[PDB]
Design an enzyme around this catalytic site. Structure first.
Site, PDB file in Angstrom:
ATOM      1  N   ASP A  25      30.455 -18.135  44.170  1.00 56.27           N
ATOM      2  CA  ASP A  25      29.821 -17.002  43.332  1.00 56.27           C
ATOM      3  C   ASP A  25      29.775 -15.870  44.621  1.00 56.27           C
ATOM      4  OD1 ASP A  25      27.912 -15.507  42.881  1.00 56.27           O
ATOM      5  OD2 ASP A  25      26.337 -17.620  42.555  1.00 56.27           O
ATOM      6  N   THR A  26      30.466 -15.170  44.917  1.00 55.81           N
ATOM      7  CA  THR A  26      30.146 -13.488  45.463  1.00 55.81           C
ATOM      8  C   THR A  26      28.238 -13.449  44.922  1.00 55.81           C
ATOM      9  OG1 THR A  26      30.728 -11.907  43.950  1.00 55.81           O
ATOM     10  CG2 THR A  26      32.547 -13.376  44.696  1.00 55.81           C
ATOM     11  N   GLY A  27      27.664 -13.508  44.671  1.00 52.57           N
ATOM     12  CA  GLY A  27      26.790 -12.582  44.473  1.00 52.57           C
ATOM     13  C   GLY A  27      25.778 -14.174  44.718  1.00 52.57           C
TER      14      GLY A  27
HETATM   15  C1  LIG Z   1      18.081 -13.243  47.047  1.00 51.42           C
HETATM   16  N1  LIG Z   1      18.879 -14.016  47.731  1.00 51.42           N
HETATM   17  C2  LIG Z   1      19.866 -14.597  47.158  1.00 51.42           C
HETATM   18  C3  LIG Z   1      21.075 -13.626  47.620  1.00 51.42           C
HETATM   19  O1  LIG Z   1      21.229 -14.677  48.586  1.00 51.42           O
HETATM   20  C4  LIG Z   1      20.841 -15.926  48.162  1.00 51.42           C
HETATM   21  O2  LIG Z   1      22.245 -16.361  48.128  1.00 51.42           O
HETATM   22  C5  LIG Z   1      21.447 -17.518  46.549  1.00 51.42           C
HETATM   23  C6  LIG Z   1      21.059 -16.909  45.983  1.00 51.42           C
HETATM   24  O3  LIG Z   1      21.677 -15.812  45.668  1.00 51.42           O
HETATM   25  C7  LIG Z   1      22.116 -15.863  43.654  1.00 51.42           C
HETATM   26  O4  LIG Z   1      20.831 -16.482  43.818  1.00 51.42           O
HETATM   27  N2  LIG Z   1      22.542 -15.349  43.290  1.00 51.42           N
HETATM   28  C8  LIG Z   1      22.320 -14.862  41.839  1.00 51.42           C
HETATM   29  C9  LIG Z   1      22.459 -12.751  42.261  1.00 51.42           C
HETATM   30  C10 LIG Z   1      21.815 -13.252  42.881  1.00 51.42           C
HETATM   31  C11 LIG Z   1      20.110 -12.863  42.090  1.00 51.42           C
HETATM   32  C12 LIG Z   1      18.818 -12.453  42.313  1.00 51.42           C
HETATM   33  C13 LIG Z   1      18.908 -11.727  43.613  1.00 51.42           C
HETATM   34  C14 LIG Z   1      20.035 -11.875  44.677  1.00 51.42           C
HETATM   35  C15 LIG Z   1      21.445 -12.070  44.131  1.00 51.42           C
HETATM   36  C16 LIG Z   1      23.639 -15.448  41.294  1.00 51.42           C
HETATM   37  O5  LIG Z   1      25.014 -14.433  41.794  1.00 51.42           O
HETATM   38  C17 LIG Z   1      24.035 -15.292  40.305  1.00 51.42           C
HETATM   39  N3  LIG Z   1      22.985 -15.957  39.167  1.00 51.42           N
HETATM   40  C18 LIG Z   1      23.426 -17.246  38.537  1.00 51.42           C
HETATM   41  C19 LIG Z   1      23.728 -18.181  39.360  1.00 51.42           C
HETATM   42  C20 LIG Z   1      22.825 -19.024  40.396  1.00 51.42           C
HETATM   43  C21 LIG Z   1      24.524 -19.633  38.568  1.00 51.42           C
HETATM   44  S1  LIG Z   1      22.073 -14.918  38.648  1.00 51.42           S
HETATM   45  O6  LIG Z   1      20.918 -15.909  38.140  1.00 51.42           O
HETATM   46  O7  LIG Z   1      21.561 -13.791  39.003  1.00 51.42           O
HETATM   47  C22 LIG Z   1      22.194 -14.784  37.113  1.00 51.42           C
HETATM   48  C23 LIG Z   1      22.319 -12.928  36.519  1.00 51.42           C
HETATM   49  C24 LIG Z   1      23.083 -12.958  35.702  1.00 51.42           C
HETATM   50  C25 LIG Z   1      23.483 -13.987  34.291  1.00 51.42           C
HETATM   51  N4  LIG Z   1      24.037 -13.584  33.375  1.00 51.42           N
HETATM   52  C26 LIG Z   1      22.767 -14.785  34.777  1.00 51.42           C
HETATM   53  C27 LIG Z   1      22.306 -15.692  35.865  1.00 51.42           C
HETATM   54  C28 LIG Z   1      20.268 -16.396  46.880  1.00 51.42           C
END
Ligand SMILES: CN[C@H]1CO[C@@H]2OC[C@H](OC(=O)N[C@@H](Cc3ccccc3)[C@H](O)CN(CC(C)C)S(=O)(=O)c3ccc(N)cc3)[C@@H]21
Ligand SMILES: [Cl-]
Ligand SMILES: [Cl-]
Ligand code: NA
Lengths: 99, 99
Positions: A25-27
């Site tokens: 997960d690059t996000g």
């Molecule tokens: C802010 N802390 C954050 C950043 O660094 C940390 O590491 C772990 C967490 O990161 C995240 O949760 N990253 C997510 C992106 C994301 C979401 C919100 C904010 C930034 C990035 C994920 O990469 C993507 N997420 C599905 C994952 C959890 C299975 S989803 O919930 O957003 C999603 C996005 C579209 C869609 N269609 C469905 C879900 C903490």
């Protein structure tokens, strides 16, 4: 390897003696795994995502094998719906996004 | 380009003639962006992430440029904390993960 993104980029990891499936997960800044026991000290942390925050335990200097590549770093443990390998460990296995 | 992951993989996107910053996110199935106006009709969707679910508006066949690569596809709009480019548009720009 080269992984296309038509499907979720899931791989097998070994952590704490257990085999698990996790998402590359690059996000995600940080690696977050479903509840499990890990050795050594931990401290509490809050991490936020889409949907808000969850409370996790932060364990430092944990070794993980990711698709056969060993890495060490911080692992967060708590009620994540998916096991996620974040950038803190993707860098260590030399993962890049290419287009 | 080849993007390493020591920092967040942020790029510039252009949508509705406006430049925005967004995260290239292999852990996201779908692209979701912060509140903005888009043309046409929308349909309902729920997306779940680390802290739970949010309601978003689904817009189909939206023109969007991502790091200079043209895409046309589905954009979700809702209370995401950051703009995220997910796999539905990462595949259109030819992105892969490599290690
Ligand atoms: C802010 N802390 C954050 C950043 O660094 C940390 O590491 C772990 C967490 O990161 C995240 O949760 N990253 C997510 C992106 C994301 C979401 C919100 C904010 C930034 C990035 C994920 O990469 C993507 N997420 C599905 C994952 C959890 C299975 S989803 O919930 O957003 C999603 C996005 C579209 C869609 N269609 C469905 C879900 C903490
Ligand atoms: Cl780390
Ligand atoms: Cl490097
Ligand atoms: Na430790």
């Amino acid at each position: 390897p080269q992984i296309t993104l038509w499907k979720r980029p899931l791989v097998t990891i070994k952590i704490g003696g257990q085999l698990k499936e996790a998402l590359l997960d690059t996000g995600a800044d940080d690696t977050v795994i479903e509840e499990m026991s890990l050795p050594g000290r931990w401290k509490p942390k809050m991490i936020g995502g889409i949907g808000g925050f969850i409370k996790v335990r932060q364990y430092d200097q944990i070794i993980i094998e990711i698709a056969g590549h060993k890495a060490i770093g911080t692992v967060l443990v708590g009620p994540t719906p998916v096991n996620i390998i974040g950038r803190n460990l993707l860098t260590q296995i030399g993962a890049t996004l290419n287009f």
